[model samples]
Target: GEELFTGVVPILVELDGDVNGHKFSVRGEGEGDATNGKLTLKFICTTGKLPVPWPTLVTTLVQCFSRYPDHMKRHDFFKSAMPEGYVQERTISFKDDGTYKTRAEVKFEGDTLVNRIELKGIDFKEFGNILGHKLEYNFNSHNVYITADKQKNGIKANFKIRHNVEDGSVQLADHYQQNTPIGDGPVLLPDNHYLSTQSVLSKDPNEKRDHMVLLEFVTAAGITHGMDELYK
Candidate 1:
C-alpha cells in the first residue's frame, strides 16, 4: 500500500441552536425509493439564526452525490458549480480494469469554504495514507478500515466501510467518539453502483461540529459505457 489519501474535504457544520432542542435531519430523495433526482438535504433550525451558506453547501452536496456514478467527474461538476478561482486543482486517473481515482481541491470565494480530497484505488486490501490517516481496503471481504492517528487539534478518528455485494448496499460504521456513527446504512441505489463515505469529526466539541459526508455515491444508471462492463 502507498499514500492512498493525501487529504480530504472535511464536512463540519455548526448548529444554529442548542443540539438538545434542535431538529436537524438530512435525507436523500430521488426517483421512486432510490436516491436521485432533486435531493433536498434541508436542515431546520429550531431556534436562533440559520447560516445561509450551510443550506447552499448542502445543495451543492446533493448535486454532487446524487449522480452516484459520476464519482470520477466530480472535479468537472465542482469546477462548474463554483467560481473560476474556487477550484484550485483536480487530477484523475483510471486503471485498465476501469478503476478510477480522483483528487479534488476546492475553496469558496476567499478560501471560506476550503476542502480537500486526494484518494486513489477502487477495491480493498490495498493500503494508502492521507495526511496522517491510514486506510486499508479489503475488497475480498468487502471492508474498508481507516484510522487517523491525529488530525486537527489532536483529534483521532477511525471508521469502517462495508459493502454488501449480494444486496448492492453499503454501510458506514464510525468508531470515533466525537460524533454519532452509521450502522448498516444502505446505499439506496441500484446494483453495480459506487458508494463511499467519510466521517468528519471535530475536536472542538463546544463548536457543535460533527458529521459524516458522502465522498462518492455514483449509481449504475446511464452506465452503458465500456468502463461499466469492464468493472462488472
Candidate 2:
C-alpha cells in the first residue's frame, strides 16, 4: 500500500561548528510514483559539517533512490570502496499494516571517521534477504555493528561514503578502503568489494535528469574537478 502520497521531502540540515541546532523543513523530494508513492524524507544531522560532506551525502542518497525506485534502500547500493573496519547503519519504519512508512538512519564511523544522517519520526522494508533497519561503524575496530534486527536473509547493507581525511592523499584509492564485512556472522552479499558507482550513483554530465545534475540544481553544490574522486 502507498503510505504518503505527497511530493514534499523534509530535511533537518545543520552547519558545522553547531551541534544542537538544525534546519527542519520540507527541503527535498523523491521519485514521484515510481515506488508506488513518493516520500517526504526528513533529514536529521547525527554528524558531520555542512556544504562539504553532508550535502554531498544527501545528494547521493537522493540519486540512489531516484535511480533505483523499486529498491530504493540507499544502504543496499554501493559507490566507491569502504576501508576495512569502516562502519555503516540504517533503520527504517513502516506502518503496522506494512505500507511504506519513513526512513530511520544513515550512519558510518571508522578510524577518525564519524558521520551520520537520520530522518526524524517527525517521520518515518523488505522480505527474505534480511532487512534489519539499523547499521553502525567501529572507529577503533575494522568491523561494522548491527542491532540484530538489521539482518535480513544473511545480508546487512548500508550506503558507502567518503570523509575528508586530514593530510590525506588526493587519490581516491589512497584513502579508499574496501568495505569488507568482518566479525563471526552470516555471509554478506555483493561480497568483499564496495558497491560500484555504475551500480549506484553514476551519472552522465550530459544527462540533465541525472541525480548529480538534479542535486546541483537543488543545493547549488559541487566539488573540485580533479578532487571529485577523492570525495567519492
Candidate 3:
C-alpha cells in the first residue's frame, strides 16, 4: 500500500560528455497514469561543455536528451503531443493506472547515441497502492537552498533542486566557482509572477502538506492542476 502516483512518467535522461566526456543522468519518481501527466525527474550533469550561447549551452546540458524539447510541444510518434486543448475534463479509467517501464540509453554522440520510444504494455491494480500522501509531513520552502557545486577540475559540477510545493515551482541554481564571464545560466519551467501567492506556496492546504509535488505549470496567476506535482 506504499505505491504512489505523483506524476505521469519517470524518464531517466543522461548526457555522457566523457567519451572522455561528461556523464549526466536523471530519473523522475512518478508512479502510474497513462493518459497524460507531468514529468518527475532528477539528474546530475557530471561535466560541462563550453560552446554555443551562454544560456542554451547550460540549458542543453540539463536537458541532456536532444529530443525532449521537440517532444515537449513538437510531437510524439503517434498523434500531436500537444493536441488541440487540455481544457477537456476527461478522467482516465482504472485501466490506465498501472506501472510501466521503459529502458533508454546512457551515452551520447552525433546521432545522439540513441533516441527510441516504445510501448511497454500496462497492468491494472488498486489505486489504494497510493498509500502515503506524506500525510504527516512539513515543508520549509525557505530551507530549499538549491545550488551548484563546481568541482576542482572546473568543468565537472553537481547540484540540487527541489519543488517549492509551497508555490508549485521548481527551484535550482548554479555556482561558478571562479568562471565569471560565462555567468550562471539556468533554464526554468513555466513559472511567473514569477513568485506570487500560489507562487511561494501551494494554494491548497492538503497538497501543501504532501511532499510529492515537484513540477508546476505556473501561469501568470494560477498554476495548472494537471502538471502540478512534477515529481513524487
Candidate 4:
C-alpha cells in the first residue's frame, strides 16, 4: 500500500478571545458549550469532531499552531483531500507499515489544567530495528504485543503498548503481554483535514542532534500548488 491515511483532524482556524473582554469566541460550524467556568467547541473537519465561548480557544490554537502561516487560506487549501474508501484502507494500512524511527515517543498532551497528564520513555532504535526486522503483532483485551525479535526471560520481552492507572496514560513497554486486532486509537483523517506529526522530527535536538529521519508528513496538493515555491 502507498503512504496514504484518512481521518478527521479538526484544526481550529479562527478565534476571538475575551469577548466583551470576558468570555471568548471561536468561529467554526456550530455553537459553543459553556458551563461552570469552562468552554468547549468542536472544530470537526468536514467530518471529525470542540469551545471556550470557545471561538477564542479556536483562535488561540490557530495562533499557537506553526501551521498555516498564510492564515486560513492555507487551511482553505488543505481542506479538500480524503474519503471512506480511503479510511477503510485507514483501518488496514498500519498492519503492513513500518518506519525507521529514531526518537521514540509514547506521550500524550492536552491540558494539565483541565485534565493533567504526563509521559516519558521509548527506544526508537530498538523499535525501528524490531519492526522491519521480521515480526508480527499479538493483541490482547488489555494490551497489544509484537512477537519478539529475541527471547526475554522464559519468553522474549515483547514490544507492547499497555495501559496504566497513573493518570490512565498508555505506556510502550517490553511487557510479557495479548491477541486483539486493530480498531481503537486516533480517528481516520477525513476530508479538509490534515495528518499532523512528522515521521522524523528534523530539527529536534533530542530525537537526534545531527541526524534526521527519512519520512515527512506533507500533502500532494501543497506540492502541486506551488507550496515548494513559497516554503516547504
Error of 3 at 171 (Å): 20
lDDT of 1 by residue, 167-206 (tens): 3433232222111111222112222222233222112234
RMSD of each: 19.9, 18.4, 20.1, 20.6
lDDT value, residue 208 of candidate 3: 23
Models 1 onward score TM values of 0.22, 0.25, 0.20, 0.17
Q: List candidate 2 segments past 4 Å from native.
A: 1-20, 30-56, 59-154, 158-160, 163-194, 198-232
Tens-digit lDDT track of model 2 for 1-232: 1122123323222212211233222222222221322223333333322212222233223211122222223232221112221233333222221211123222122221112233322121232111221211101111122112234322343332332233341101011112223233332233222222221223345633322212211110111223444555
Candidate 2 achieves a global lDDT of 0.24
Name the top TM-score candidate: 2
For model 3, residues 1-232, the per-residue Cα lDDT tens digits are 0011122323333332211122223222322222222223322222333111111112211112111221132211111111110111111121223222222222222322222211121342322221111111222221111121233111211222222222443323222111111222322222211111011112234532212233322112123444545657
Whole-model lDDT values for every prediction: 0.25, 0.24, 0.22, 0.21
Q: What TM-score, to 2 decimals, does candidate 4 have?
A: 0.17
Off by over 4 Å in 1: 1-7, 10-62, 65-78, 84-107, 110-220, 228-232
- Write candidate 4's Cα lDDT for 1-232 as tens digits: 0111122222222322221123222233211111111122233222111111111111112101113223223332111111111110001011222221111111112311011111111222323322222222121222111221111111111233222212333323333321111223222121232212222212224531122122222221121343466665
Better of 1 and 4 by TM-score: 1
Off by over 4 Å in 3: 1-8, 18-34, 47-232
The positional error of residue 15 in candidate 4, measured at the CA in angstroms, is: 30
User: What is the TM-score (0 to 1) of candidate 3?
Assistant: 0.20
Error of 1 at 168 (Å): 28
